Structures are given as structure tokens and as C-alpha cells.
Design a protein around this ligand. Structure first.
Ligand SMILES: O=C(O)Cc1ccc(O)cc1
Ligand code: SF4
Ligand code: SF4
Lengths: 86, 869
């Protein structure tokens, strides 16, 4: 994983964010982006029990509700009322 | 001297300057999902639910060092797309990317607009970041989400559905030509809320649990009952049902921040940073449900409302309004009970400028670069008169100015409602901030504003009391307000707050110089080879004939654009009505009507926007002087000279967008005589009666013209006359004008500023010219002045600057704003923008970092007349 997939990551912009623990700026892509041992998975549809079937772009199926809908893996799930860690 | 910014403020700005303007998809994804999942629901509730979901399902972001929290999105300079309102400026781009073919060319308005490439702007894709609309970085992995979120809106966004109906107006073709020539800068659907003033009353007074109970009570009372009102009676019930839904939304959203603050505290090893997280969890936990009970909570609650509303539509100019009066009760109680010191209040006000400075407006480049230069116009107004007609200046407003001095940022711009009743010490304090050259406070005439308010809104009952509650929607769009009784701390305070919908919507910026151009070129746009207007085929045999043909084209333009923009806003208020703003804005809640159904108290807000007023008046001056009175040149001579750019190279080749530099190609001697005659004709802004009489006549005509049209709310239009950045783009598509202004170069800034380099009789002559008519006939009148810093040295210099403002205010002048800067510095910053990351100048209604302003406006600002004393 990357900082970007961590719960401790603080979003800033489309290229970088902060590590909550170090308070230092960390990249999303590239050199320096990989997860550190203190990693704790950030809640996302990609890691929800209700999330399934994604296509090459991460677009798949939410079954959170009886009526299925589409959802995207990098969608933040920390404020989804139906989110369930897989 | 000015005290250093607080430590928190400093650390957060260090972070701020590195941030990239970022579009992401969370809000959009959730809005769209909830929307369709509720397909068939009564529209008000379906809308409310979807907005609610779009807020309360986002990732909340909290930064270390923050006391005040929340942001439009998970990103800091964040925004997101609204494909249900409009999508055309990005969906072809987006689909070109999935298909891996070339992105199509922008539309004309977009293409003639520049987003400043520096600062936070993402004007070009790089690495895994796609530049959306020449400004917003979106992560490549989201492009597919953008496409899939936007697809169900084909044919039915406000944009596309209103386009279908506009095509049935007789003037559709005319309208389309006007948009394609950029004679009309943009479509009302672009930003259907804003240029208005938010009203914080309801949650500050009730808290969300209070509000939810009020909706329960109203539902019990009226659901299923029409009273005697067969139009809207029955709709009351669905309005209260919808409000309960959006209020539940705002509550959940706050809770999400509370929970995230709680998480961050749990891992915070640094106890000091941990303290803040803990205060935040409590503050957000509290404003999720209770009436705020201290200043931090109360100010935090106004942020929840403000972010609430700017997330329900794409918009600019949602004015904060008179925050210093709205929050005075919460401030004074904290200071009294010793819960807060002033310096702690100043830290919060300092941090607050940051939060407001990071508000972005996701929209097409034409709007974001062409009009806004990226600024989102959250204008905080100060002073004026309170409910009882006495000075409204509060002690909290002094701290707002102080915060503005210590933490110098583009927003919120501060606006003094200058009133003779205002204490001298607050005026001087305000002046000492302006003299700094941040460009704020700007100065606006409280009396003239109230005068416009009584005149324009007279038919809807406007009285002296609501008139006093007015202030500036967006930059200068004088906007209705009223006072409401806030009970707090064992007393009642009438706090002010806005009371209309958008007052910067209707017929958008019409490039008047370009319309004059087309009179002279018989309807044919020579820049493009397109016949825009039906040829009039009239011999331009007199000044009166040319001006009458101008009027005829301005009236056609106004007619067709108005009818199409009514349909735009009407589709929007019917299928896309405000949820959060319908909860907040009086008298929605009391009437049981949302904004769309005229729940706001004042609905005569829709208007017509001119642009290029001085360029235009100065061209008429020149033509009348040179062609018709002195007969030194023929109208054919003038027209050829303009089409040929007086022999000079065009800004399309040189990329200099002011008089500052003309590459004097040899065809110039060919036109040197007529060019000099044009530069030399009487010029507005010199107390010259020849020019000033044309200017005056323009005012009486334009007032008369605009009030013949009717908005979708059934009210007469009136004139808004500002420029914002629009003189960039509309300048660009205009060939050389008869005042000697060259092709492609900016129009004159504002609307009562002198054209650059043509004021030669000193600032006071500008004042005399500007005030040859009564400014309250219209919404506003925009004047920029630039002072060299030496011009305002010393406390004496602060006083001299205030006396300058008083002089213009007392003549009736509506507004003046200042740059205090050395234009050579700006010239230098242009050459090497990497070296001035924090440099700001005042443009028109806004302050922006230099590095994010495009070359045309930069040039324009460089060339403005610099006053040494
Ligand atoms: O938001 C603002 O105040 C700037 C602006 C003003 C008028 C307009 O029509 C568009 C943007
Ligand atoms: S992976 Fe580790 S704690 Fe998580 S953001 Fe902090 S350095 Fe990356
Ligand atoms: S239930 Fe929520 S978090 Fe889980 S996949 Fe669906 S929308 Fe995502």
C-alpha cells in the first residue's frame, strides 16, 4: 500500500497529502509513496464487504442496499453508513 | 507595526502555498447516486436528500494545527463537478481521454480566457493528474468516475435541457451567435447561486436539532393542507420535509468531522496538536445538534452553512456578509466570561481567512479564468447602520480588520459600508489596512446602497429596516438583507443576513465595445468572419444614427439572452432548487416556499451586466469628435483604422494586453494622424463635459433599457456594472476601438475607473466625472485607483487615504478600491513569478496572488495609472 491507502493520511491535493503521524508531506505516486509499518487501512469502497465486481478502472458494484448500484474503489468510505470492513 | 500571524496560521499557510487546486468526485458521485436512487420522489425532497448525501458521505479532512475545520471536499483547495447543472466544458474532454484520442478544442469563451499558470492552478496535465478546464487537477483514476457520473445527465442537465427550450425561442440563432462571439461572456446556468449574501440566522438561533423539531412541527401542522392557496399551499409540506432532510444532512456532516477529529486525537503523540483535535471533536460534535454556545462554535457553524451552500451548486460570490455583527453576541460573551481573550479571537479570525481563501469554484475556464481569476468572492462586509439606524460597527469588526492585517490572504475581501455615522477610529483602522496594498478593505457607499435598495425593491415592500441590512453580494452586487432576532446570552440582537436569491444572474457581461464594433462593421464580426447580427445596412450618416443602431443591437442582444437565461435559471429552480440555502434564506422557512418558488423576501434580484463601459463611452467620444462634429475623418476612415489596428501589431501576436507596449509596424504612420486624434479626443474621467455628457446619457438610457425586460421571477431587470476579470476576454475578442485602445487588449477595468493612461487631471477629476449621475439608479459602480506606496506614508498617509475615500463617498460615489503598489514591482513579478509566490494585487472586486492571474489582467493591472500624491 501507499500513504494514500492509509487511515493516517491527511488529504491535501491531487499530488500529495500529510502523514498524520510524522506531519510531513507525502506523495501519492512514485518514489516515497509506499506504506510504512505503522500503516492502518483507510476505509474505502475498494475495501468494503459490500463492494464487488470492479472493472479495470476500479468501478464496480455496491450491494450495501437491496437495490445494487455502482461505486468506485478509491471512494472514501469512512462516512458511508453501510460500510463494512471486508 | 503589524503583529506576526499566529503559529498555527503560519504553519497552515506554509502548507497552503504548496497546494494544488484539485477536482475530485466524492460529492458528485454521492449526489448522483442518491438522486437516481430516489427517482420518483417529490422534487424538493429528492433534491434535499441528494445534496444531504453529497455532503454527509464525503471524506472529512482535518489538518494538524487547525482550530477551525471543514473544506468543500476531502482536498484543501477542493471542488467537484456538477454534471446535472453543466458538463459540456469537461465531458468531451473526459471521453476523449477514455478513448485515448485527442481532446477536442475548447469553445470560444473558454479559449479566449486565461487561467494563471502559477500558484495552485493545474493548467496542464502532468504525471497522474489531468488538468480539467485548464485549472483543476483531477487524479487520472477518477476520470472514469467522472465519465460514469456524468453520463446519466445527457440531454437533461440544466445546460442541455434549457438548451432544448432555448432552441424554441425565436431568437435562438441570434443568441447562439452572441455567445460564440463572446459578446455575452457566459450562461447563467454556470453559477446559478452566488453574488448574494448568505444568512446564518437559523442554525445560529436554533441549532440543527432545533431546526429538525421546527420541521416536525410544521409538517404536523400543514402536510396535506393547502389553506386557501391552491398554487403553493400543498407544497409547504414537501418544503418542510425537504428541510428536515437537508438539516439531517448538515448534522451528519458535522458528526463526520467530529469522528475524524476523535480519530486524529487518538493517534496524536504531540499533546499540543492533540488538544486542538479534542476541541474540534467537541466543537463539531456540538454544532451537529445544539445551538452554538461560544464563539468558536458559532463561527464554526457559519462555516458549516457557508460550505454547505457552496457545495450545493457551482457558484462564486456567496458573500459571508456582516460576520462581525452576526457574531458580536457570541464574541462578547466569550470575552466577558473570560472564555476567550481577544488574541485567541484574532487567531480564529486569522485561521478563518485561510478557510475562506481555499474556497474554489469548479466551472468552465471562461468563468474561472475569464471572469473570476480563480477568486470566489466570499465578501465580508463591515459597519453601515444597524436595525435601529445607528452605527453598526462592533468591537468584533476591529478584530476582523486586525486578522486581515496579520494574516494577509486574498479572502475574505473586506468591505466597509462607509457611513457618516461610523466611528473615526474604525474608519482609520480600516484605512490603515487598505493602505497596505492588499486591496482590502474596499469602500462602498452605505447610503447609496440603501438608496438602490429602496428604489429597486420598493415594489416588494423594502423598508428602511431591511435596507439597512443590505451589503455586497459577491464583489459589488448590492444584495437585499434583513435583520432577525437572535436570542443569546439573555438578550436579543437583530443580526443581519441576506434576504434575496442571486443578484448577479440574468443577462451576463455584454461587451459593449464589441457591440459598437459590430454597428460599424454592419453586424459582421471581423475577428472571426461570422455574421453575428442581422446587417442593419444603414449609412452611418450621423452620431445619432450610429448610437441608435448601437441601442438597437443592445436591445436585441438583451432580449434574446434574457429569454434564454430565464429558461436556464427556471429549469434550475424547478429541477434543481436550493436545499441548504432554502433552509437558511428568509422568508423560505416562514412561508414554506424554497428559493425557487420565491420563498426569499426579495426576488427582484435578476439583472443585466455591462462590460467595457469606459472603453465604450471613450470610443463614442472619439467618433463624435473626429467623425461627426469636427468631420476631420470619415466613418469609413475610422472603421478601417480600427480594423487595421491603427497599423500596430495585435495582441494576438505580441501578447501584450495593454497600451503598455505596441510593436509599431510600418503601417502605423499610415494611421498615425487618426490614431493620435483618437487618443486625443475627450476622455471620460477628466471632468471633461464632452466625454462626461455621453457617459451621463449612457446611464439614463441603460437604466431605461434594462427595466423593460423581465426576469423569470417576473421582475424588471436593472444594471449591474462591474468588470471582475471579464475585460480580459471581452477585450480579447474586440478589435481596436475608436478611443485608441488596441486589438485584443483589455477593456477598461471596472465601470467608473478612467481608461488606463487617460486620466490626466488628477483623481478628483475622476470623482467629478463618475458622479455626473446618481449612483443609486443602478446596483453599483466600480472604481479602481492605484497609489504609489510613497503616496500614503505615515499615519498622515492613512488619514489622507481616508479623506480621499470620504471625498468620493460624499459626492455620492458608490465604491472605490485601491492598489498601493509600485507598478515596476508588478512588471518584475511578471518576468519571474517564481520569485513572488505571496505577492497579491487588487484586480476588480477581488485580491489574488499574482502568480495565479493571467497575463492579460496582469498587464492590465500593471498599466493602471499610478498616483504619486
Ligand atoms: O462572484 C463574484 O462576485 C464574481 C462574479 C460577479 C458577477 C458574475 O456574473 C460572475 C462572477
Ligand atoms: S503509511 Fe505511515 S502512518 Fe500512513 S500516512 Fe503516515 S508514513 Fe504513510
Ligand atoms: S456500502 Fe458504502 S462503503 Fe460499502 S461499497 Fe457501498 S457505498 Fe462503498
Amino acid at each position: 500500500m501507499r500513504h494514500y491507502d492509509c487511515k493516517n493520511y491527511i488529504n491535501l491535493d491531487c499530488e500529495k497529502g500529510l502523514c498524520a503521524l510524522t506531519k510531513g508531506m507525502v506523495p501519492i505516486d512514485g518514489e516515497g509513496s509506499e506504506a510504512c509499518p505503522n500503516f492502518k487501512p483507510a476505509e474505502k469502497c475498494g475495501n468494503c464487504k459490500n463492494f464487488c465486481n470492479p472493472d479495470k478502472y476500479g468501478l464496480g458494484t455496491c450491494t450495501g442496499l437491496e437495490k445494487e448500484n455502482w461505486a468506485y474503489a478509491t471512494c472514501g468510505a469512512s462516512a458511508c453508513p453501510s460500510y463494512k470492513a471486508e | 507595526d503589524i503583529p506576526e500571524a499566529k503559529e498555527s496560521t503560519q504553519k497552515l499557510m506554509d502548507i497552503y502555498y504548496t497546494l494544488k487546486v484539485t477536482a475530485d468526485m466524492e460529492a458528485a458521485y454521492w449526489y448522483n447516486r442518491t438522486w437516481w436512487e430516489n427517482d420518483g420522489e417529490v422534487i424538493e425532497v429528492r433534491r434535499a436528500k441528494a445534496v444531504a448525501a453529497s455532503l454527509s458521505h464525503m471524506t472529512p479532512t482535518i489538518l494538524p494545527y487547525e482550530k477551525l475545520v471543514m473544506n468543500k471536499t476531502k482536498n484543501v483547495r477542493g471542488a467537484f463537478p456538477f454534471p446535472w447543472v453543466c458538463a459540456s466544458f469537461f465531458n468531451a474532454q473526459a471521453e476523449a481521454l477514455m478513448n485515448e484520442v485527442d481532446a477536442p478544442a475548447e469553445n470560444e469563451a473558454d479559449s479566449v480566457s486565461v487561467v494563471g499558470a502559477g500558484g495552485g492552478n493545474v493548467t496542464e496535465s502532468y504525471g497522474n493528474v489531468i488538468s480539467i478546464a485548464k485549472k483543476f487537477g483531477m487524479r487520472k483514476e477518477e476520470i472514469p468516475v467522472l465519465v460514469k457520473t456524468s453520463k446519466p445527465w445527457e440531454g437533461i442537465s440544466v445546460e442541455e435541457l434549457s438548451n432544448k427550450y432555448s432552441k424554441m425561442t425565436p431568437g435562438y440563432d441570434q443568441f447562439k451567435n452572441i455567445m460564440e462571439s463572446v459578446i455575452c461572456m457566459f450562461d447563467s446556468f454556470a453559477i446559478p447561486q452566488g453574488r448574494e449574501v448568505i444568512n446564518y440566522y437559523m442554525p445560529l438561533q436554533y441549532g440543527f436539532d432545533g431546526i429538525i423539531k421546527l420541521c416536525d412541527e410544521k409538517i404536523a401542522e400543514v402536510m396535506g393542507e393547502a389553506g386557501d392557496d391552491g398554487d403553493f399551499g400543498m407544497s409547504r409540506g414537501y418544503y418542510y420535509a425537504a428541510m428536515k432532510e437537508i438539516t439531517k444532512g448538515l448534522s451528519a456532516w458535522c458528526e463526520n468531522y467530529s469522528k475524524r477529529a476523535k480519530y486524529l486525537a487518538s493517534i496524536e503523540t504531540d499533546s499540543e496538536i492533540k488538544a486542538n483535535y479534542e476541541k474540534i471533536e467537541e466543537v463539531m460534535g456540538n454544532i451537529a445538534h445544539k445551538k452554538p454556545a461560544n464563539f468558536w462554535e458559532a463561527i464554526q457553524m457559519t462555516l458549516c452553512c457557508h460550505f454547505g451552500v457552496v457545495n450545493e451548486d457551482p457558484q462564486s460570490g456567496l458573500s459571508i456578509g456582516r460576520l462581525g455583527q452576526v457574531l458580536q453576541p457570541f464574541y462578547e460573551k466569550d470575552v466577558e466570561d473570560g472564555i476567550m481573550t481577544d488574541e485567541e479571537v484574532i487567531e480564529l479570525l486569522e485561521l478563518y481567512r485561510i478557510k475562506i481563501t481555499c474556497i474554489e469554484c469548479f466551472a468552465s475556464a471562461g468563468v474561472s479564468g475569464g471572469v473570476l481569476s480563480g477568486n470566489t468572492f466570499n465578501n465580508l462586509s463591515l459597519g453601515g447602520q444597524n436595525y435601529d439606524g445607528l452605527s453598526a460597527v462592533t468591537p468584533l469588526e476591529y478584530l476582523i480588520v486586525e486578522a486581515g492585517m496579520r494574516n494577509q490572504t486574498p479572502q475574505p475581501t473586506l468591505s466597509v459600508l462607509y457611513d457618516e455615522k461610523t466611528p473615526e477610529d474604525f474608519l482609520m483602522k480600516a484605512a490603515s489596512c487598505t493602505k497596505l496594498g492588499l486591496g482590502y478593505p474596499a469602500w462602498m457607499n452605505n447610503q447609496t446602497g440603501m438608496n438602490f435598495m429602496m428604489r429597486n425593491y420598493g415594489p416588494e415592500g423594502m423598508d428602511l429596516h431591511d435596507a439597512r441590512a443590505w451589503c455586497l453580494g459577491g464583489c459589488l452586487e448590492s444584495a437585499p438583507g434583513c435583520f432577525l432576532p437572535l436570542e443569546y446570552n439573555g438578550k436579543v440582537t437583530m443580526i443581519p443576513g441576506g434576504a434575496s436569491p442571486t443578484c448577479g444572474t440574468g443577462v451576463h457581461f455584454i461587451g459593449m465595445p464589441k457591440v459598437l464594433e459590430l454597428v460599424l462593421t454592419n453586424g459582421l464580426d471581423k475577428r472571426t468572419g461570422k455574421q453575428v447580427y442581422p446587417p442593419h445596412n444603414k449609412k452611418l450618416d450621423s452620431y445619432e444614427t450610429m448610437v441608435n443602431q448601437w441601442k438597437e443591437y443592445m436591445e436585441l442582444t438583451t432580449d434574446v439572452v434574457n429569454r434564454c437565461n430565464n429558461i436556464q435559471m427556471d429549469i434550475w429552480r424547478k429541477y434543481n432548487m436550493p436545499a441548504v440555502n432554502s433552509l437558511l434564506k428568509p422568508d423560505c422557512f416562514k412561508k414554506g416556499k424554497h428559493i425557487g418558488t420565491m420563498g426569499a423576501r426579495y426576488n427582484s434580484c435578476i439583472n443585466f451586466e455591462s462590460c467595457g463601459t469606459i472603453t465604450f463611452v471613450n470610443s463614442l467620444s472619439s467618433i463624435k469628435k473626429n467623425v461627426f462634429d469636427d468631420s476631420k475623418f470619415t466613418i469609413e476612415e475610422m472603421t478601417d483604422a480600427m480594423l487595421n489596428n491603427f497599423g500596430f501589431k495585435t495582441a494576438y501576436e505580441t501578447e501584450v494586453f495593454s497600451p503598455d507596449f505596441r510593436e509599431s509596424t510600418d503601417k502605423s504612420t499610415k494611421y498615425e494622424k487618426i490614431f493620435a486624434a483618437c487618443v486625443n479626443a475627450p476622455k471620460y474621467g477628466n471632468a471633461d463635459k464632452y466625454a462626461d455628457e455621453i457617459f451621463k446619457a449612457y446611464h439614463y438610457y441603460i437604466y431605461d433599457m434594462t427595466h423593460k425586460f423581465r426576469s423569470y421571477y417576473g421582475k424588471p431587470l436593472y444594471l449591474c456594472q462591474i468588470s471582475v476579470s471579464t475585460h480580459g476576454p471581452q477585450g480579447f475578442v474586440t478589435l481596436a476601438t475608436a478611443d485608441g485602445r488596441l486589438a485584443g487588449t483589455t477593456y477598461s477595468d471596472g465601470s467608473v475607473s478612467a481608461a488606463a493612461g487617460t486620466d490626466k487631471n488628477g483623481i478628483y477629476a475622476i470623482f467629478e466625472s463618475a458622479t455626473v449621475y446618481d449612483h443609486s439608479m443602478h446596483q453599483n459602480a466600480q472604481m479602481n485607483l492605484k497609489l504609489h506606496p510613497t503616496a500614503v506614508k505615515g499615519i498622515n498617509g492613512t488619514r489622507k487615504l481616508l479623506d480621499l475615500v470620504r471625498a468620493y463617498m460624499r459626492k455620492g460615489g458608490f465604491h472605490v478600491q485601491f492598489n498601493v503598489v509600485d507598478s515596476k514591482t508588478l512588471r518584475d513579478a511578471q518576468l519571474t513569478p517564481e520569485k513572488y509566490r505571496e505577492l497579491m494585487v487588487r484586480v476588480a472586486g477581488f485580491t489574488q496572488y499574482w502568480c495565479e492571474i493571467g497575463k492579460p489582467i496582469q498587464d492590465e493591472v500593471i498599466y493602471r495609472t499610478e498616483y504619486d500624491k
